[PDB]
Structure 1
C-alpha cells in the first residue's frame, strides 16, 4: 500500500573464514542473530560481533549439547 521505500541492507554474515591467520582486533564474523558463538580466546561485542583476542588461526566447530556452532582460535 503506497510502498516504494526500501531500507539499506546492512551486510551481515561471516567475512573471515576458517584457516585464516588473523591478528588481534579482527572480526571473525558479524551475524545479526547468534548463528556462531564464541569459544576459547574469542570475544563477543554488544552487536553479536565475534573478534579474536589474540593472534592465531581461527576455526569453526559444532559444539554444545544444544547443537550450536562456536568459533575458536588456536596458536599458529
Structure 2
C-alpha cells in the first residue's frame, strides 16, 4: 500500500548553553514539548505553555541536576 507521510518541526532542542548570556525572555529550551527533560527553577518558573523554558532575568544559563528524581533544571544566574 502507501505509508509515506510525515510532519514537520524546525527546532526541538535548547538554545541556551550554560555560558549563554540570555537576557529578558529568551527561550532557553523551546519545543522540548514537555516540562520533564528540563524544568525551570532559577529565574522563578518558566514553562509557560507548550512547556517552552524561558529566562526571566538578564543572565547566564545554568544547567543542573537537582531533586530526588535526578531531574534536569535550567537556571538563570546573574553575570
TM-score (norm 1): 0.52
Question: Shift in Å at residue 15 of structure 1?
Answer: 11
SS of aligned partner of 2:21:
coil
Structure 1 unaligned residues grouped into runs of 5+: none
Q: Deviations over 1:36-75 (max 9, x none)?
A: 4444435111101000011011110001111100010111
Which one of the candidate residues 5, 28, 52 is aligned to 2:55?
52
- CA contact 1:24–1:52 (8 Å) conserved in 2: yes
Q: Which has the higher strand share?
A: 1
Q: What is the root-mean-square deviation of aligned Cα atoms in Å?
A: 5.8
**Moved runs in structure 1, 4+ residues, more than 2 A?**
1-42
Q: What residue is the counterpart of 1:71 in the other structure?
A: 74
Change (3 A) 1:14 1:2: same
How many residues of Structure 1 are paired with residues of Structure 2 in the alignment?
A: 76
